[PDB]
Amino acid sequence: GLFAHELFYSILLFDLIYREETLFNVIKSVTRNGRSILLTALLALILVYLFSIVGFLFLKDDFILEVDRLPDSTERACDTLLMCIVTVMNHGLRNGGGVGDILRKPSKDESLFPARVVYDLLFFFIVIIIVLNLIFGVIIDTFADLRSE
Amino acid sequence: EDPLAYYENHTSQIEIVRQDRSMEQIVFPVPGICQFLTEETKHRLFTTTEQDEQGSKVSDFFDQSSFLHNEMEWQRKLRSMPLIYWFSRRMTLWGSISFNLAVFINIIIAFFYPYMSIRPLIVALILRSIYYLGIGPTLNILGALNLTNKIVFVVSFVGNRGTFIRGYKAMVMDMEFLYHVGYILTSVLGLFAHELFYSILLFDLIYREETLFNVIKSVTRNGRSILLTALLALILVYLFSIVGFLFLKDDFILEVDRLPDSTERACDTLLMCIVTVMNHGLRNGGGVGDILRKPSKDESLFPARVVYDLLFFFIVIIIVLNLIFGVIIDTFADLRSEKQKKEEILKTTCFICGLERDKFDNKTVSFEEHIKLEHNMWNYLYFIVLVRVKNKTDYTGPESYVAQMIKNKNLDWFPRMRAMSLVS
Ligand SMILES: Nc1ncnc2c1ncn2[C@@H]1O[C@H](COP(=O)(O)OP(=O)(O)OP(=O)(O)O)[C@@H](O)[C@H]1O
Ligand SMILES: [Ca+2]
Ligand SMILES: [Zn+2]
């Protein structure tokens, strides 16, 4: 920080964890079963990978994403499986409703509307409501175990 | 080389309770077939047996005695056969290699599809294969290696676990065997039908990692409650859709993007209104009010719309949806408590007689000595095998009583809540 750049001093703010036992105890909930948390994250990644495979195979056209260009307004995001995986992981996981939010809004007259509905609801329930909540459940269980010990 | 050492190592002792309710000590020579038993099976039996209503594991141990004996026989035969022994011993190696291969093939498929420690060294080899032969040839070679290794692994598995010993029907019955056959089928489909079929193999992480299986057990143990809560949510969504169709139909206008108007009505039929509510209100954080049309204040239905949206939010989004997470959280604690209780019992109680550690305090024999020498479940198993093997004519006094009790299915010859040393 002294000899290279002033913004390097920002890392020193982490000393609060060392100083305060309360914050350290709180973080111990995350750290004690961090392996469980990471395994749950890996399971989420695998499920996202399978969903991306399904979308690429059958729902490719619906993957249209808007973009802002520095000095068209839409780009296809499922031309390649890596692109589709990146889109799903980045947007569906972060969005409250899942992939259906980013995916194009389907008309009722369209034949694949039931398939799209099932796809979105399955993603929401399997990933957003169950898999993602398991990490928080693990953290709470670690809290309880630490308290009991 | 010491005869006394050999005999001491090959001699065993047990304590039995006779018909007159008196305890006696039986010293017997360890049967030869006993040495072939596997440490893995011993650990599994020790850590997996479940207490009965009365709190004794002796019943289940005696029940599994026969499977243990058959396993010992097939262990002797397997050691007799040389080549299969080498494959059987290294079961973990095949599984680890198969898992690494699955991970690598899936990584390549994800990164390149559509196209056209020694782990770092293997990664370098794969990279060179991609650079020289190409993505497709590298994937083909990796898949062939995976299939060959999975065949080796299934052979090693059937050899080690001896599932067939119970019978072909039992072998098919075993769920782990079916999982391995499903893995083989998935590998074949990946190799021949389509490359994307290799994705399903990534589920092997759950099987490999016990921690991830424990995490998923929170979802699966009380999963019926979760499905019932989902059904309750569906019922409430159905009622809300009925209300919307009857009174708030016009507000159900949803924007639509069309492939080559900008809005469409979504509550012209009750099925469609249900689909709209279930698909959109549940996924949206606020609820159905988010998708529904924004009401102007001057409109007469604004007070009704406010109540509709807030009631949906509180009943469905806040309460019903949170009940599933509450169920998962409660299952976590239930599993933790069960595990802790089982561990405490296993650590602090005798397997056979069930006496606690504290009872042995300030005594000549420690609890460790009691479990090691006085009461050894493996010594009891050895005695049972001795009774089975020995000819009826040569039975001794105690052996005859134990054999008769075994035939009559009476488990009172085991000592329960009694130890000779504690008595005197
Ligand atoms: N009745 C019992 N209650 C509690 N623990 C038991 C009981 N019987 C055996 N054990 C434990 O089961 C494990 C298996 O004991 P075992 O006689 O195989 O020990 P070992 O040290 O591997 O053998 P060895 O010294 O004869 O080569 C040991 O931890 C023993 O303490
Ligand atoms: Ca005789
Ligand atoms: Zn005992």
Coordinates of C-alpha atoms and ligand atoms in Angstrom, one line a residue:
Chain A
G1 CA 0.0 0.0 0.0
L2 CA 2.8 2.4 0.9
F3 CA 5.0 1.8 -2.1
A4 CA 2.8 0.7 -5.0
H5 CA -0.8 2.1 -4.8
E6 CA -3.1 3.5 -2.1
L7 CA -5.9 1.2 -2.9
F8 CA -3.9 -1.8 -1.6
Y9 CA -4.7 -0.6 2.0
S10 CA -8.3 -1.8 1.4
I11 CA -7.3 -5.4 2.1
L12 CA -6.3 -4.4 5.7
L13 CA -10.0 -3.9 6.5
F14 CA -10.3 -7.7 6.9
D15 CA -8.6 -7.4 10.3
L16 CA -12.0 -6.9 11.8
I17 CA -12.6 -10.6 11.6
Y18 CA -9.4 -11.3 13.5
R19 CA -10.2 -8.6 16.1
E20 CA -13.9 -9.6 16.8
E21 CA -14.7 -13.1 18.0
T22 CA -18.4 -12.6 17.2
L23 CA -17.8 -12.1 13.5
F24 CA -15.3 -14.9 13.5
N25 CA -17.9 -17.2 15.1
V26 CA -20.5 -16.1 12.5
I27 CA -18.1 -16.9 9.7
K28 CA -17.3 -20.3 11.3
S29 CA -20.8 -21.3 10.3
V30 CA -19.9 -20.9 6.7
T31 CA -16.4 -22.4 7.1
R32 CA -17.1 -25.5 9.2
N33 CA -19.2 -27.3 6.5
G34 CA -17.6 -25.4 3.6
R35 CA -17.1 -28.7 1.9
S36 CA -20.8 -29.4 2.1
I37 CA -21.6 -25.9 0.7
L38 CA -19.1 -26.4 -2.2
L39 CA -20.6 -29.9 -3.0
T40 CA -24.1 -28.3 -3.1
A41 CA -22.7 -25.7 -5.5
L42 CA -21.2 -28.4 -7.7
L43 CA -24.6 -30.2 -7.7
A44 CA -26.2 -26.9 -8.8
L45 CA -23.7 -26.6 -11.6
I46 CA -24.4 -30.1 -12.8
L47 CA -28.1 -29.5 -12.8
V48 CA -27.5 -26.2 -14.7
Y49 CA -25.4 -28.2 -17.2
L50 CA -28.2 -30.7 -17.8
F51 CA -30.8 -27.9 -18.2
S52 CA -28.5 -26.1 -20.7
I53 CA -28.2 -29.3 -22.7
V54 CA -32.0 -29.7 -22.8
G55 CA -32.5 -26.0 -23.8
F56 CA -29.8 -26.3 -26.6
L57 CA -31.4 -29.4 -28.0
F58 CA -35.0 -28.2 -28.0
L59 CA -35.4 -24.6 -26.9
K60 CA -32.5 -22.9 -28.7
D61 CA -34.5 -20.2 -30.4
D62 CA -35.9 -18.9 -27.2
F63 CA -32.5 -17.9 -25.9
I64 CA -32.5 -14.3 -27.1
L65 CA -30.8 -11.8 -24.8
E66 CA -30.7 -8.0 -25.1
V67 CA -27.4 -6.2 -25.0
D68 CA -26.1 -2.6 -24.8
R69 CA -23.3 -1.7 -27.2
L70 CA -20.5 0.8 -26.5
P71 CA -19.9 3.4 -29.2
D72 CA -28.6 -5.2 -33.3
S73 CA -30.0 -4.8 -29.8
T74 CA -30.4 -8.6 -29.3
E75 CA -28.0 -11.5 -29.6
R76 CA -28.4 -15.3 -29.6
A77 CA -27.0 -16.9 -26.4
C78 CA -27.4 -20.6 -27.1
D79 CA -25.6 -21.1 -30.4
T80 CA -22.9 -23.1 -28.6
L81 CA -23.3 -25.2 -25.4
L82 CA -20.7 -23.2 -23.5
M83 CA -22.6 -20.0 -24.3
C84 CA -25.8 -21.6 -23.2
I85 CA -24.3 -22.9 -20.0
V86 CA -22.8 -19.5 -19.3
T87 CA -26.2 -17.8 -19.9
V88 CA -28.1 -20.2 -17.7
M89 CA -25.6 -20.1 -14.8
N90 CA -25.2 -16.3 -14.9
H91 CA -28.8 -15.2 -15.4
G92 CA -31.2 -18.0 -14.3
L93 CA -29.4 -18.6 -11.0
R94 CA -29.2 -14.9 -10.1
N95 CA -32.8 -14.2 -11.2
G96 CA -35.5 -14.9 -8.7
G97 CA -37.7 -16.8 -11.1
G98 CA -34.9 -18.6 -12.9
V99 CA -34.2 -19.0 -16.6
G100 CA -37.7 -18.2 -17.7
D101 CA -37.1 -14.5 -16.9
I102 CA -34.3 -14.2 -19.5
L103 CA -35.9 -16.6 -22.0
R104 CA -38.2 -15.1 -24.6
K105 CA -41.8 -14.7 -23.5
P106 CA -43.8 -17.4 -25.4
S107 CA -47.1 -16.8 -27.1
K108 CA -50.0 -19.1 -26.1
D109 CA -50.6 -20.0 -29.8
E110 CA -47.1 -21.5 -30.0
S111 CA -46.9 -25.2 -30.0
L112 CA -44.0 -25.5 -27.6
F113 CA -45.7 -23.3 -24.9
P114 CA -46.4 -26.3 -22.6
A115 CA -42.8 -27.4 -23.0
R116 CA -41.6 -24.0 -22.1
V117 CA -43.9 -23.7 -19.1
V118 CA -42.7 -27.1 -17.8
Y119 CA -39.0 -26.1 -18.4
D120 CA -39.3 -22.9 -16.5
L121 CA -41.3 -24.3 -13.5
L122 CA -38.9 -27.3 -13.3
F123 CA -35.9 -25.1 -13.2
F124 CA -37.4 -22.8 -10.6
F125 CA -38.4 -25.7 -8.3
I126 CA -35.4 -27.9 -8.7
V127 CA -32.7 -25.3 -8.7
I128 CA -33.9 -22.0 -7.2
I129 CA -36.2 -23.3 -4.5
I130 CA -34.4 -26.5 -3.4
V131 CA -30.7 -26.6 -4.5
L132 CA -30.0 -23.0 -3.7
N133 CA -31.8 -23.1 -0.4
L134 CA -29.8 -26.1 0.7
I135 CA -26.7 -23.9 1.2
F136 CA -28.6 -21.7 3.6
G137 CA -29.9 -24.8 5.3
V138 CA -26.3 -26.1 5.7
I139 CA -25.3 -22.7 7.2
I140 CA -28.2 -22.8 9.7
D141 CA -27.4 -26.4 10.7
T142 CA -23.8 -25.4 11.2
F143 CA -25.0 -22.6 13.5
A144 CA -27.0 -25.1 15.5
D145 CA -24.1 -27.5 15.8
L146 CA -21.6 -24.9 16.9
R147 CA -24.1 -23.7 19.5
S148 CA -24.6 -27.2 20.9
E149 CA -20.9 -27.9 21.0
Chain B
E1 CA 7.8 -68.9 15.7
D2 CA 6.5 -68.9 19.3
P3 CA 4.0 -71.7 19.8
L4 CA 2.4 -70.0 22.7
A5 CA 2.1 -66.8 20.7
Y6 CA 0.5 -68.7 17.8
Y7 CA -2.0 -70.5 20.0
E8 CA -2.9 -67.3 21.9
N9 CA -3.5 -65.5 18.7
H10 CA -5.7 -68.4 17.4
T11 CA -7.6 -68.9 20.7
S12 CA -10.8 -67.0 21.6
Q13 CA -13.2 -66.7 24.5
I14 CA -16.9 -65.8 25.0
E15 CA -19.4 -65.6 27.9
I16 CA -22.7 -67.4 27.6
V17 CA -25.8 -67.6 29.8
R18 CA -27.1 -71.1 30.5
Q19 CA -30.7 -72.2 31.1
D20 CA -30.2 -71.9 34.9
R21 CA -29.5 -68.2 34.3
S22 CA -25.8 -68.6 35.3
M23 CA -22.9 -67.3 33.3
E24 CA -20.1 -69.4 32.0
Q25 CA -16.9 -68.7 30.0
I26 CA -16.3 -70.8 26.8
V27 CA -12.8 -70.9 25.5
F28 CA -12.7 -72.2 21.9
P29 CA -10.1 -72.5 19.1
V30 CA -10.8 -69.9 16.4
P31 CA -12.1 -71.5 13.2
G32 CA -9.7 -71.3 10.3
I33 CA -12.3 -69.8 8.0
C34 CA -12.7 -66.9 10.3
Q35 CA -9.4 -65.3 9.2
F36 CA -10.8 -64.6 5.7
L37 CA -13.3 -62.0 6.9
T38 CA -12.8 -58.5 5.5
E39 CA -12.2 -55.4 7.6
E40 CA -14.6 -53.5 5.3
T41 CA -17.4 -55.8 6.1
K42 CA -16.5 -55.8 9.8
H43 CA -16.7 -52.0 9.9
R44 CA -19.9 -51.9 7.9
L45 CA -21.6 -54.4 10.3
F46 CA -20.3 -52.5 13.3
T47 CA -21.5 -49.1 12.1
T48 CA -24.7 -50.1 10.3
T49 CA -26.6 -52.4 12.7
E50 CA -29.7 -51.0 14.2
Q51 CA -31.1 -51.4 17.7
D52 CA -34.4 -53.2 18.2
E53 CA -37.3 -52.1 20.5
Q54 CA -35.5 -53.5 23.6
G55 CA -32.3 -51.7 22.6
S56 CA -30.1 -54.7 21.6
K57 CA -28.2 -55.2 18.3
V58 CA -27.6 -58.9 19.0
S59 CA -30.7 -59.9 16.9
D60 CA -29.5 -58.2 13.8
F61 CA -25.9 -59.4 14.3
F62 CA -27.1 -63.0 14.6
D63 CA -29.3 -62.5 11.5
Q64 CA -26.3 -61.3 9.4
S65 CA -24.0 -64.1 10.7
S66 CA -25.0 -66.3 7.8
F67 CA -24.1 -63.7 5.2
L68 CA -20.8 -63.2 7.0
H69 CA -20.1 -66.9 6.7
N70 CA -20.9 -67.0 3.0
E71 CA -18.7 -64.0 2.5
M72 CA -15.8 -65.7 4.3
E73 CA -16.2 -68.7 2.0
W74 CA -16.1 -66.6 -1.1
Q75 CA -13.1 -64.6 0.3
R76 CA -11.2 -67.9 0.5
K77 CA -12.2 -68.9 -3.0
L78 CA -11.3 -65.4 -4.3
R79 CA -7.8 -65.5 -2.7
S80 CA -7.5 -69.0 -4.3
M81 CA -8.0 -67.5 -7.7
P82 CA -5.0 -65.2 -8.4
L83 CA -5.8 -62.9 -11.3
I84 CA -9.2 -61.6 -10.1
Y85 CA -7.6 -60.9 -6.7
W86 CA -5.5 -58.1 -8.2
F87 CA -8.5 -56.4 -9.8
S88 CA -10.7 -56.9 -6.7
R89 CA -8.2 -55.4 -4.3
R90 CA -7.9 -52.1 -6.3
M91 CA -11.6 -51.3 -6.5
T92 CA -11.1 -47.7 -5.4
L93 CA -8.6 -47.0 -8.2
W94 CA -11.1 -47.9 -10.9
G95 CA -13.8 -45.7 -9.5
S96 CA -11.5 -42.8 -9.1
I97 CA -10.2 -43.1 -12.6
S98 CA -13.8 -43.4 -14.0
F99 CA -14.9 -40.3 -12.1
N100 CA -11.9 -38.3 -13.4
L101 CA -12.6 -39.5 -16.9
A102 CA -16.3 -38.5 -16.6
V103 CA -15.3 -35.1 -15.4
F104 CA -12.8 -34.5 -18.2
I105 CA -15.1 -35.7 -21.0
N106 CA -17.9 -33.5 -19.7
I107 CA -15.6 -30.5 -19.5
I108 CA -14.4 -31.1 -23.1
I109 CA -18.0 -31.5 -24.3
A110 CA -19.1 -28.3 -22.5
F111 CA -16.2 -26.3 -23.8
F112 CA -16.2 -27.4 -27.4
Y113 CA -19.6 -28.8 -28.3
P114 CA -20.7 -28.4 -31.1
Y115 CA -17.4 -29.1 -32.8
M116 CA -16.7 -29.4 -36.5
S117 CA -0.3 -36.0 -8.5
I118 CA -0.7 -37.5 -12.0
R119 CA -3.8 -35.5 -12.7
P120 CA -1.8 -32.6 -14.1
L121 CA 0.1 -35.0 -16.3
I122 CA -3.2 -36.6 -17.5
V123 CA -4.6 -33.2 -18.2
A124 CA -1.4 -32.4 -20.3
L125 CA -1.9 -35.6 -22.2
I126 CA -5.5 -34.7 -23.0
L127 CA -4.5 -31.2 -24.1
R128 CA -1.8 -32.7 -26.4
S129 CA -4.4 -35.1 -27.8
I130 CA -6.7 -32.2 -28.5
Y131 CA -3.9 -30.3 -30.2
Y132 CA -2.7 -33.3 -32.3
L133 CA -5.6 -35.6 -33.1
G134 CA -8.5 -33.2 -32.4
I135 CA -11.5 -32.7 -30.1
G136 CA -13.5 -35.5 -31.6
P137 CA -10.8 -38.1 -31.6
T138 CA -9.8 -37.2 -28.0
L139 CA -13.4 -37.5 -26.9
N140 CA -13.7 -40.9 -28.6
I141 CA -10.5 -42.2 -26.9
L142 CA -11.6 -40.9 -23.5
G143 CA -15.0 -42.6 -23.9
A144 CA -13.5 -45.9 -24.9
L145 CA -11.2 -45.8 -21.9
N146 CA -14.1 -44.9 -19.7
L147 CA -16.1 -47.9 -20.9
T148 CA -13.2 -50.3 -20.5
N149 CA -12.6 -49.0 -17.0
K150 CA -16.2 -49.3 -16.0
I151 CA -16.3 -52.9 -17.2
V152 CA -13.2 -53.6 -15.1
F153 CA -14.9 -51.8 -12.1
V154 CA -18.1 -53.7 -12.3
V155 CA -16.2 -57.0 -12.4
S156 CA -14.2 -55.9 -9.4
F157 CA -17.4 -54.8 -7.6
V158 CA -19.1 -58.2 -8.1
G159 CA -16.0 -60.0 -7.1
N160 CA -15.5 -57.9 -3.9
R161 CA -19.0 -57.6 -2.6
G162 CA -20.1 -61.2 -3.6
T163 CA -23.6 -60.0 -4.4
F164 CA -24.2 -63.0 -6.7
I165 CA -23.5 -65.4 -3.8
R166 CA -27.0 -64.7 -2.5
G167 CA -28.2 -65.4 -6.0
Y168 CA -28.8 -64.0 -9.4
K169 CA -32.1 -62.6 -8.2
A170 CA -30.4 -61.0 -5.2
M171 CA -27.7 -59.5 -7.5
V172 CA -30.3 -57.9 -9.7
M173 CA -32.1 -56.8 -6.5
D174 CA -29.1 -54.9 -5.2
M175 CA -29.6 -51.2 -5.9
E176 CA -25.9 -50.3 -6.1
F177 CA -25.5 -53.0 -8.8
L178 CA -28.4 -51.5 -10.8
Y179 CA -26.8 -48.0 -10.4
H180 CA -23.5 -49.4 -11.9
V181 CA -25.4 -51.1 -14.8
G182 CA -27.1 -47.8 -15.5
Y183 CA -23.7 -46.1 -15.5
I184 CA -22.5 -48.7 -18.0
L185 CA -25.6 -48.1 -20.2
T186 CA -25.1 -44.4 -20.1
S187 CA -21.4 -44.8 -21.1
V188 CA -22.4 -47.0 -24.0
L189 CA -25.0 -44.4 -25.1
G190 CA -22.5 -41.6 -24.9
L191 CA -19.9 -43.6 -26.9
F192 CA -22.3 -44.6 -29.7
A193 CA -25.7 -42.7 -29.8
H194 CA -24.8 -39.2 -28.9
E195 CA -21.9 -37.4 -27.1
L196 CA -24.2 -35.3 -24.8
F197 CA -25.3 -38.5 -23.1
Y198 CA -22.1 -38.3 -21.1
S199 CA -23.7 -35.5 -19.0
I200 CA -25.8 -37.9 -16.9
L201 CA -22.6 -39.5 -15.6
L202 CA -21.9 -36.4 -13.6
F203 CA -24.5 -37.6 -11.0
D204 CA -21.8 -40.0 -9.8
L205 CA -20.6 -37.2 -7.5
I206 CA -23.6 -37.8 -5.2
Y207 CA -22.6 -41.5 -4.9
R208 CA -19.0 -40.7 -4.4
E209 CA -19.3 -37.9 -1.8
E210 CA -21.1 -39.0 1.4
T211 CA -21.4 -35.3 2.4
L212 CA -23.4 -34.4 -0.7
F213 CA -25.6 -37.5 -0.1
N214 CA -26.2 -36.3 3.4
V215 CA -27.2 -32.9 2.1
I216 CA -29.6 -34.4 -0.3
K217 CA -31.0 -36.5 2.5
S218 CA -32.5 -33.4 3.9
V219 CA -34.7 -33.0 0.8
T220 CA -35.4 -36.7 0.4
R221 CA -36.2 -37.9 4.0
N222 CA -39.3 -35.9 4.5
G223 CA -39.9 -35.3 0.8
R224 CA -43.6 -36.4 1.0
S225 CA -44.3 -33.3 3.1
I226 CA -42.6 -31.1 0.5
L227 CA -44.8 -32.6 -2.3
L228 CA -47.9 -32.1 -0.1
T229 CA -47.0 -28.5 0.5
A230 CA -46.6 -28.1 -3.3
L231 CA -50.0 -29.5 -3.7
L232 CA -51.4 -27.1 -1.2
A233 CA -49.7 -24.3 -3.2
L234 CA -51.4 -25.6 -6.3
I235 CA -54.8 -25.6 -4.6
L236 CA -54.4 -22.0 -3.4
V237 CA -53.2 -21.0 -6.9
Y238 CA -56.3 -22.7 -8.4
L239 CA -58.6 -20.7 -6.0
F240 CA -56.8 -17.4 -6.7
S241 CA -57.2 -18.1 -10.5
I242 CA -60.9 -18.8 -10.0
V243 CA -61.2 -15.4 -8.3
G244 CA -59.3 -13.6 -11.0
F245 CA -61.3 -15.2 -13.8
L246 CA -64.6 -14.3 -12.1
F247 CA -63.8 -10.7 -11.1
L248 CA -60.3 -9.6 -12.2
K249 CA -60.2 -11.0 -15.7
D250 CA -59.3 -7.9 -17.6
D251 CA -56.2 -7.2 -15.5
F252 CA -54.6 -10.4 -16.8
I253 CA -52.7 -8.9 -19.8
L254 CA -49.2 -10.4 -20.4
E255 CA -46.7 -9.0 -22.8
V256 CA -45.6 -11.4 -25.5
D257 CA -42.6 -11.5 -27.9
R258 CA -43.5 -13.2 -31.2
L259 CA -41.3 -15.0 -33.7
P260 CA -41.6 -13.9 -37.3
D261 CA -49.9 -7.4 -31.2
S262 CA -47.4 -6.9 -28.3
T263 CA -49.8 -8.1 -25.6
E264 CA -52.2 -11.0 -25.2
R265 CA -55.0 -11.9 -22.7
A266 CA -54.1 -14.7 -20.3
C267 CA -57.3 -15.3 -18.3
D268 CA -59.9 -16.1 -21.1
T269 CA -60.0 -19.7 -19.8
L270 CA -59.6 -21.1 -16.3
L271 CA -56.9 -23.5 -17.4
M272 CA -54.9 -20.6 -18.9
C273 CA -55.5 -18.4 -15.9
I274 CA -54.2 -21.1 -13.6
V275 CA -51.2 -21.6 -15.9
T276 CA -50.4 -17.9 -15.8
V277 CA -50.8 -17.6 -12.0
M278 CA -48.7 -20.8 -11.3
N279 CA -46.0 -20.0 -13.7
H280 CA -45.6 -16.3 -13.1
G281 CA -46.9 -15.3 -9.6
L282 CA -45.0 -18.1 -7.8
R283 CA -41.7 -17.3 -9.6
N284 CA -42.1 -13.6 -9.2
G285 CA -41.0 -12.3 -5.8
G286 CA -43.9 -9.9 -5.3
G287 CA -46.5 -12.4 -6.6
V288 CA -49.2 -12.3 -9.3
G289 CA -49.6 -8.5 -8.8
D290 CA -46.3 -8.1 -10.5
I291 CA -47.5 -9.5 -13.8
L292 CA -51.0 -8.1 -13.4
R293 CA -51.9 -4.8 -15.0
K294 CA -51.1 -1.7 -12.9
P295 CA -54.3 -0.3 -11.5
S296 CA -55.1 3.4 -11.6
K297 CA -56.4 5.0 -8.4
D298 CA -59.5 6.4 -10.0
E299 CA -60.6 2.9 -11.0
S300 CA -63.2 1.4 -8.7
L301 CA -61.5 -2.0 -8.5
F302 CA -58.3 -0.6 -7.0
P303 CA -59.2 -1.5 -3.3
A304 CA -60.0 -5.0 -4.4
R305 CA -56.8 -5.3 -6.4
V306 CA -54.7 -4.2 -3.5
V307 CA -56.2 -6.8 -1.2
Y308 CA -55.9 -9.5 -3.9
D309 CA -52.2 -8.8 -4.4
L310 CA -51.3 -8.5 -0.7
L311 CA -53.3 -11.7 0.2
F312 CA -51.5 -13.7 -2.6
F313 CA -48.2 -12.4 -1.4
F314 CA -48.7 -13.2 2.2
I315 CA -50.5 -16.6 1.8
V316 CA -48.6 -18.1 -1.0
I317 CA -45.2 -16.4 -1.5
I318 CA -44.5 -15.7 2.2
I319 CA -46.0 -18.7 4.0
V320 CA -46.6 -21.6 1.7
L321 CA -43.4 -21.3 -0.3
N322 CA -41.4 -20.9 2.9
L323 CA -42.9 -24.0 4.4
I324 CA -40.9 -26.2 2.0
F325 CA -37.7 -24.5 3.2
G326 CA -38.8 -25.0 6.8
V327 CA -39.3 -28.7 6.2
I328 CA -35.8 -29.0 4.7
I329 CA -34.3 -27.1 7.6
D330 CA -36.1 -29.3 10.1
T331 CA -35.0 -32.4 8.3
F332 CA -31.4 -31.2 8.7
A333 CA -31.7 -31.0 12.4
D334 CA -33.5 -34.4 12.7
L335 CA -30.7 -36.1 10.7
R336 CA -28.1 -34.4 12.9
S337 CA -29.7 -35.5 16.1
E338 CA -30.2 -39.1 14.9
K339 CA -26.5 -39.2 13.9
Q340 CA -25.3 -37.8 17.2
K341 CA -27.4 -40.3 19.2
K342 CA -26.2 -43.3 17.2
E343 CA -22.6 -42.2 17.5
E344 CA -22.9 -41.8 21.3
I345 CA -24.5 -45.2 21.7
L346 CA -21.9 -46.9 19.5
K347 CA -19.0 -45.2 21.3
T348 CA -20.2 -45.6 24.9
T349 CA -22.1 -48.9 24.9
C350 CA -21.1 -52.5 24.6
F351 CA -22.4 -54.1 21.4
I352 CA -23.4 -57.4 23.0
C353 CA -24.5 -56.8 26.6
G354 CA -25.1 -53.0 26.3
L355 CA -23.5 -52.1 29.6
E356 CA -22.4 -48.4 29.9
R357 CA -18.8 -47.2 30.4
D358 CA -19.6 -45.7 33.8
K359 CA -20.4 -49.1 35.2
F360 CA -16.8 -50.2 34.7
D361 CA -15.3 -47.2 36.5
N362 CA -13.0 -47.9 39.4
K363 CA -12.8 -51.6 38.5
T364 CA -10.1 -54.1 37.7
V365 CA -11.3 -54.5 34.0
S366 CA -11.7 -51.3 31.9
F367 CA -14.5 -50.9 29.4
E368 CA -11.9 -51.2 26.6
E369 CA -10.7 -54.5 28.1
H370 CA -14.3 -55.7 28.4
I371 CA -15.1 -55.0 24.7
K372 CA -11.7 -56.3 23.5
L373 CA -11.5 -59.6 25.4
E374 CA -14.6 -60.4 27.6
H375 CA -17.3 -59.4 25.1
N376 CA -16.2 -59.4 21.4
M377 CA -18.9 -59.6 18.8
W378 CA -16.4 -61.1 16.4
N379 CA -15.6 -63.8 19.0
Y380 CA -19.3 -64.6 19.2
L381 CA -19.5 -64.8 15.4
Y382 CA -16.5 -67.1 15.5
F383 CA -18.2 -69.3 18.1
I384 CA -21.4 -69.4 15.9
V385 CA -19.2 -70.5 12.9
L386 CA -17.6 -73.1 15.1
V387 CA -21.0 -74.6 16.1
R388 CA -22.0 -74.7 12.4
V389 CA -18.8 -76.3 11.2
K390 CA -18.3 -78.8 14.0
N391 CA -19.9 -82.2 13.7
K392 CA -22.8 -82.8 16.0
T393 CA -21.2 -85.9 17.6
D394 CA -18.2 -83.9 18.8
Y395 CA -20.2 -81.1 20.4
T396 CA -19.2 -80.2 23.9
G397 CA -21.6 -79.3 26.7
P398 CA -21.8 -75.6 26.1
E399 CA -21.7 -76.1 22.3
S400 CA -24.7 -78.4 22.5
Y401 CA -26.7 -75.8 24.4
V402 CA -25.7 -73.0 22.1
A403 CA -26.6 -75.1 19.0
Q404 CA -30.0 -76.0 20.5
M405 CA -30.7 -72.4 21.3
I406 CA -29.7 -71.4 17.7
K407 CA -32.0 -74.0 16.2
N408 CA -34.9 -72.8 18.5
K409 CA -34.2 -69.2 17.5
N410 CA -33.6 -68.2 21.2
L411 CA -31.1 -65.4 21.6
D412 CA -30.8 -65.7 25.4
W413 CA -27.4 -67.4 25.3
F414 CA -26.0 -64.0 24.5
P415 CA -25.2 -62.0 27.7
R416 CA -27.6 -59.0 28.2
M417 CA -26.9 -56.3 30.8
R418 CA -24.5 -58.7 32.7
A419 CA -20.8 -59.2 32.9
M420 CA -18.8 -61.6 35.0
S421 CA -16.1 -59.1 36.1
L422 CA -18.7 -56.6 37.4
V423 CA -20.4 -59.4 39.3
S424 CA -17.0 -60.3 40.8
Ligands
LIG1 N1 -18.7 -55.6 22.0 C1 -18.0 -54.6 21.5 N2 -18.3 -53.4 21.9 C2 -17.7 -52.3 21.4 N3 -16.7 -52.3 20.6 C3 -16.4 -53.6 20.2 C4 -17.0 -54.7 20.6 N4 -16.4 -55.8 19.9 C5 -15.5 -55.3 19.2 N5 -15.4 -53.9 19.3 C6 -14.5 -53.0 18.6 O1 -14.5 -53.4 17.2 C7 -13.2 -53.2 16.6 C8 -12.7 -54.5 16.1 O2 -11.9 -55.2 17.0 P1 -10.8 -56.2 16.6 O3 -10.7 -57.4 17.5 O4 -11.0 -56.6 15.1 O5 -9.5 -55.3 16.7 P2 -8.1 -55.3 16.0 O6 -7.1 -54.4 16.8 O7 -8.2 -54.9 14.5 O8 -7.6 -56.8 16.1 P3 -6.2 -57.6 16.4 O9 -5.6 -56.8 17.6 O10 -6.8 -59.0 17.0 O11 -5.4 -57.8 15.2 C9 -12.3 -52.7 17.7 O12 -12.5 -51.3 17.8 C10 -13.0 -53.3 19.0 O13 -12.8 -52.4 20.0
CA2 CA -20.0 -87.1 21.8
ZN3 ZN -20.2 -56.5 27.1

